[PDB]
RNA sequence: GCAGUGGUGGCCGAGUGGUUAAGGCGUCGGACUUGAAAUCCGAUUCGCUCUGCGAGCGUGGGUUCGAAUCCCACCCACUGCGC
RNA sequence: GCAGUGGUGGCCGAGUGGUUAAGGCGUCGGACUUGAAAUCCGAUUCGCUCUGCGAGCGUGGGUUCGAAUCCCACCCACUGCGC
């Protein structure tokens, strides 16, 4: 049935290694820059807005919004050293606007690099699906302490019954809505209820949490397919 | 053979399960313990040998670079060797050589020992196998078809002579003990059986294949067993010397047909209807009704052979399909039989399960095995290196195909069954499914032309 | 083997005819003189041995009757038993010497006799070069048309041949035959067996190996080293794989007295043949044309040795083969083989050579031979059931002819029936083919 | 075609041996006494009639006619010693009425045992067919000198196209109307013209020479067959 | 593969240390009978210099003056085992 | 069986004593792109304690610090012979 229970332990203990070898084999050429960020969230629209990018990758999510709006300071978090080195070697990088640092969002703590209750917006774009479902609230609590008590957290990631979930063969299933790719990285497909009751258990307040529907079409192969991402915004209670 | 990683416990293996299986087959356990210790030592020896090879390679690379830059004259590192004259690196290479040679000897010994321990270990058992060692008591009868209690006058030993289709004495003069001439109406009947079986299997989707009868020793070792290859196979010798062995079944050359190949998963269920003459050296007579043409040295056999996907329980569905094909064959021939599940102690090393079709001989009053259907899983494909996909994955290990075989029709034994089951007082009635393939005049009855040798 | 009375002028024979025949066969003619001298000395030795045995038996009878070398019956009747024992010792020494001489003479006498070929039929072309003097006796069909592919490509285009994997499994020339070509070979066997069964032949499936003591009597020394595989059992038996089913069929009646009434014995041998010599002579001889293992259907006839019936049966056998190949639509010519290329047993041989339009050559498909009593007297297969007093026995005549070697006939069918879309099925094999293969064998691969 | 010319020479030189071995293997049991003799010929009917029996066999032709008529003296001629010994050991034999002697009728001469021009009747009953066709006139001349100049010679033997001539296989033929039996003895089948011109060439005179027709019938096998013997009487010219 | 009994002529079958290998059965030819035959007479392993002598009883050897008869080996059957 | 030339990865095909076994072709999966793809990114012999190191160029050996490159043997092809 599911993947061997021994193998799932090897996947959990080698999560950072699997993401590091991904950046080794694929360099910065796999993912593409996300220019839809500023438009999608009512924040990030056009003073000194300090931001934390949890799971920054090689950029692709902060460099666009950072060359767009020129009064944003950014913290960058990633547990893979290769991704950090790629972010630093980017020609668009300057220390006066970015502060990149490695931090395993489940084991390490964010206060060792960012000041408490300082960040006004933190982004979770396709980062939480790579974390084991039983260590996600660890990440939510780790980022709960650096958020300004009126600030918020922005989240887009896979949703239930997306096509990518569809495609996976049965030999790639770790559990309910929990799969693994050929390269070792994993994918959890969230539901609105699961994410809601995962954010509520760590002290957040739901604002918007609803699915976003798209489609993928390759004209040459004439392939058009449905896609289901879950977008949301949670807010830290004022008082 | 089994996968060596089933014994490595540092990998996801478990030798305790191999011990349980080796007990259920009533074979010798402790071979699992010898295997586990040999394997655990071989893993460390492999690590050390890789490291010594890396050091030797790095010494050679450094020497080449020193020489091409025209130089003036084992905790080693890359930079560490970069600070030595060529003579000193060669002095180091000599120590590397000595260590590599002794490690290589130890590793070759450990590999051979682990493999000779893995050789005996039988395949894993399907949970449907009856655990036992008494074949006469625990053979599990599964199904019965027809009337398996009727009695008739003559046994096949008389019937083959009353139709004048058998020459035993002259055959033994020509070939020796058990040699025989088949003649007259029984040559036509054998050919009719071959035509009918080939046509049936071809309509089911099998590819008829006529195999060579001489297999080379290098290839026969990979498809046969120690005991068979020792005392059961004839050896052929030409001019020179001669490493050839007459095949005991067509399953042996057909297994070596896709030897050392990467088979596409699409088209994986390859089905072959082998047709050849088989040469078996063991012919022991347990009474009169096992003489005649029942146990002979040479006979034609039609075999089923299937290469299958190792996933999704597909080889076991294929196993059921093959036994069903043989069952329907003998039901269209109108021969009663029962299906028996063989006990653990009687399976050979490759089989995970074996079914037998045992036909009722009314003139002998006995059950005699006509069909033998086995599922050997990847035990043989691993030995022959018949891989399941065309591409090897990044990290995963190579997967092998499953290989099943099942006799469709051994001509002499089936002729004996037809003769005993279709005898009347005036001759042998021809089975309705064989009348297409018989000559005119032999399409209704094979008449008795001689008296019974017993009478 | 020839009758030893043909070499004895004392009997109604003479070795001059044997010398002239050894010249016609372009063999050595000095064997006849050695044989005649050995034979003339052996007759004297045999007479002396019989006389010594007679004296010994009279000595024994005298001693036996009394207890209860110019010697005569009455002469011994007047001696003390001790004297008869002394005489018996003298007779024993003489008998020992005479038996040594007689065994030596018989040995040399048989060595020179097993190398003199059969007498020739007056129709045989006397010559030694086969390629010019073989009398093309008759033509059938169109033996000049030419077509695109040879069999070496056609067996691959229909996907019925596996040579590389066969050479991995069995070695040089090993092969798997698969698919449509197995069905075609089986159809050929069925058609040949029914054709021969309608003519009065008895189908016979033979053993594939033979004891050496029996194989010696049907084969020559040249064959054993050059062409016969040896089978080894356990404990190290001495069996040989048969090169043709004529060899076991010949031994089926060894040491028998056949009834003249049932003398026209005809058998249709079916077996697998094993040859070692597979030497190649170009591409058109590769494929399944010259292999180590193939099925063959044979004609074997035991005939009366009287009234020219053997030669009438010879003509009948070659006519049966010819009709088989005319009904298949294979063009051929019949060839009278020259005396130089005859085996020892044959007194005349006719080959049927078929035209191969893709190869552009004639290839031998049938060989018909009349060995008269050469092998019958070596196997002691006797014509009458009763022997006459003071009259030597006659042996039957034995004839063999290939009906169908399946691989070569498949090659000829493929080359003669190829179209652009596949191979047309011969009209006479359609009833023996599976449904779906009764009009055309389709091409499924490209030509190499 | 015909029998080997070498074999025909062996048959001619071994004629006496072949007849002797016949009497050895068959004893006196093969042929049966001829009681039809006295009736068939007008001679031999009921003074002192001296007779010569050429080819006497073991009797079977003179003992019947000799126990019938008691005033007949008989000379007996045969080249086989066994036949002579059987004739002598016959209990019906007495020297006062018979004079048996061996004489090869072709090589030997009759005057060495019988007086010239003395015999008044000589019988040739199935004797001339055993003689080679080129040595028959030898026998006729050998017996011409012992016949009284008014006496005669009585002859019965096989004729042309008799059944026995038919039965014989082609491998038993020595020449035109000339065959050999399994035992080596031969059979010549005479024609009226041949016998006439054979007796005329030696000084005889024909009286009667005509065929006699019988048959043979075995009821159990239902076999009835024609038989053609040639009977004749030749007479020595008076003056 | 052992550990017992066996092996006769075209076939059956006697055979007892001095056969003519009996008796049958089958097959094959010869028949000249007047008293023909609803049968009779024979032959029927190999060899030789052939009216005789020699060899041959699964095949080879031994003992004996002499073996088809007694001994041994091998081969092949049948009866019990191993497999 | 001799007396010549040859043998590279799934296939073709480079290869020059210091490769990363080039380039293709085939196959296989991954794709998160709002500037989606009439495509892109990769992988694709064996082994080990796996971000690397080791082995592998018909198979075995030799020379060299170092061989896919040079040498030898064997095997198998092709070209000429013997047969
Ligand atoms: N538990 C964890 N702690 C810190 N980073 C993590 C993490 N789990 C996964 N990641 C990082 O999250 C990244 C997801 S790839 C997505 C990158 C980014 N969201 C973008 O839009 O480009 C990976 O590079 C991985 O390194
Ligand atoms: N040339 C010859 N001279 C003498 N006798 C001869 C002979 N040729 C044949 N015979 C004898 O003639 C005999 C013929 S058998 C006939 C015997 C006699 N006629 C009868 O009626 O019984 C044979 O016995 C043979 O010995
Ligand atoms: Mg007998
Ligand atoms: Mg007898
Ligand atoms: Mg003996
Ligand atoms: Mg290649
Ligand atoms: Mg490449
Ligand atoms: Mg190599």
Give the arrangement of secondary structure elements.
The complex is a heterotetramer, with 2 copies of chain A (239 residues) and 2 copies of chain B.
Chain A: H1 5-13, H2 15-26, H3 37-40, E1 49-54, H4 63-68, E2 72-78, H5 81-88, E3 98-102, E4 119-125, H6 136-144, E5 147-158, H7 163-167, E6 173-175, E7 178-180, E8 186-188, H8 192-199, E9 205-218, E10 223-235
Parallel strand pairs in A: 1-2, 1-4, 2-3, 4-5
Antiparallel strand pairs in A: 5-10, 6-7, 7-8, 9-10
Chain B: H1 15-24, H2 31-68, H3 78-81, H4 86-120, H5 135-138, E1 140-145, H6 156-162, E2 166-167, H7 169-174, E3 181-183, H8 185-204, E4 207-210, E5 214-216, H9 217-223, H10 226-232, E6 235-237, E7 244-246, H11 251-255, E8 261-262, E9 270-279, E10 298-308, H12 314-332, E11 337-341, E12 353-361, E13 366-375, H13 379-384, E14 386-387, E15 402-410, H14 411-422, E16 427-429, E17 445-447
Helix pairs in contact in B: 1-2, 2-4, 6-14, 8-14
Chain B binds 2 RNA strands through α2, α4 and α7.
Keywords:
heterotetramer; A: 239 residues; alpha/beta; Rossmann fold; 7-stranded mixed beta sheet; B: 455 residues; Helix Hairpins; BirA Bifunctional Protein, domain 2; 8-stranded mixed beta sheet; 3-stranded antiparallel beta sheet; 14 helices; binds S-adenosyl-L-homocysteine; binds magnesium ion; RNA-binding; aminoacyl-trna synthetase (chain C); tRNA binding (chain C); aa-tRNA-synt_IIb (chain C)
């Amino acid at each position: 049935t599911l993947v061997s229970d021994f193998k799932q332990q090897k996947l959990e203990q080698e999560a950072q290694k699997n993401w590091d070898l991904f950046y080794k084999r694929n360099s910065t050429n796999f993912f593409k820059d996300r220019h839809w960020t500023t438009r999608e969230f009512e924040e990030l629209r056009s003073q000194k807005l300090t931001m934390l990018e949890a799971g920054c990758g090689v950029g692709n999510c902060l460099f666009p919004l950072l060359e767009e709006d020129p009064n944003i300071f950014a913290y960058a978090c990633d547990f893979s050293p290769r991704a950090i080195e790629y972010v630093k070697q980017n020609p668009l990088y300057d220390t006066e606007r970015c502060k990149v640092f490695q931090c395993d969002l489940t084991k390490d703590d964010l206060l060792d690099h960012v000041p408490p209750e300082s960040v006004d917006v933190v982004m979770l774009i396709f980062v939480l699906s790579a974390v084991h479902p039983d260590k996600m609230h660890l990440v939510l609590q780790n980022i709960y302490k650096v958020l300004k008590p009126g600030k918020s957290v922005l989240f887009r990631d896979y949703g239930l019954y997306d096509h990518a979930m569809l495609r996976f063969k049965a030999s790639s299933k770790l559990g309910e809505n929990f799969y693994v790719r050929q390269d070792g990285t994993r994918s959890y497909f969230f539901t609105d209820d699961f994410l809601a009751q995962l954010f509520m258990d760590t002290g957040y307040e739901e604002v918007v949490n609803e699915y976003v529907f798209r489609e993928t079409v390759n004209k040459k192969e004439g392939l058009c397919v449905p896609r289901v991402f879950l977008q949301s915004k949670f807010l830290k209670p004022p008082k | 053979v089994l996968d060596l990683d089933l014994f490595r416990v540092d990998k996801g293996g478990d030798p305790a399960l191999i011990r349980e299986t080796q007990e259920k087959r009533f074979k010798d356990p402790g071979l699992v313990d010898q295997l586990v210790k040999a394997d655990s030592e071989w893993r460390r020896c492999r690590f050390r040998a890789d490291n010594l090879n890396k050091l030797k390679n790095l010494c050679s690379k450094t020497i080449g670079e020193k020489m091409k830059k025209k130089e003036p004259v084992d905790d080693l590192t890359a930079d560490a060797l970069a600070n030595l004259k060529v003579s000193q690196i060669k002095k180091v290479r000599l120590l590397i050589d000595e260590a590599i040679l002794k490690c290589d000897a130890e590793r070759i010994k450990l590999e051979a020992e682990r493999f000779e321990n893995l050789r005996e270990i039988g395949n894993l058992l399907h949970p449907s196998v009856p655990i036992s060692n008494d074949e006469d008591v625990d053979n599990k009868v599964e199904r019965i078809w027809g009337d398996c209690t009727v009695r008739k006058k003559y046994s096949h030993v008389d019937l083959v002579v009353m139709v004048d289709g058998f020459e035993g004495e002259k055959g033994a003069v020509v070939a020796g003990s058990r040699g025989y001439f088949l003649k007259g109406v029984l040559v036509f009947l054998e050919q009719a059986l071959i035509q009918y079986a080939l046509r049936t299997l071809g309509s089911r989707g099998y590819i008829p294949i006529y195999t060579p009868f001489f297999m080379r020793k290098e290839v026969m070792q990979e498809v046969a067993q120690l005991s068979q290859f020792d005392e059961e196979l004839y050896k052929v010798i030409g001019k020179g010397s001669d490493e050839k062995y007459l095949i005991a079944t067509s399953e042996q050359p057909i297994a070596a047909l896709h030897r050392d190949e990467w088979l596409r998963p699409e088209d994986l269920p390859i089905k072959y209807a082998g047709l050849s003459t088989c040469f078996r050296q063991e012919v022991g007579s347990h009474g009169r009704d096992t003489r005649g043409i029942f146990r002979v040295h040479q006979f034609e056999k039609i075999e089923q052979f299937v290469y299958s996907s190792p996933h999704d329980n597909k080889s076991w569905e294929m196993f059921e399909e093959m036994i069903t094909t043989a069952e329907e064959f003998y039901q269209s021939l109108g021969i009663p039989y029962h299906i028996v599940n063989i006990v653990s102690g009687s399976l050979n090393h490759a089989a995970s399960k074996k079914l037998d079709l045992e036909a009722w001989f009314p003139g002998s009053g006995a059950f005699r095995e006509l069909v033998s259907c086995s599922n050997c899983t990847d035990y043989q494909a691993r030995r022959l290196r018949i891989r399941y996909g065309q591409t090897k994955k990044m990290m995963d290990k190579v997967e092998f195909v499953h290989m099943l075989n099942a006799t469709m029709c051994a001509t002499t034994r089936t002729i004996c069954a037809i003769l005993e089951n279709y005898q009347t007082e005036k001759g042998i009635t021809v089975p309705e499914k064989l009348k297409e393939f018989m000559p005119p005049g032999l399409q209704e009855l094979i008449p008795f032309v001689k008296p019974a040798p017993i009478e």
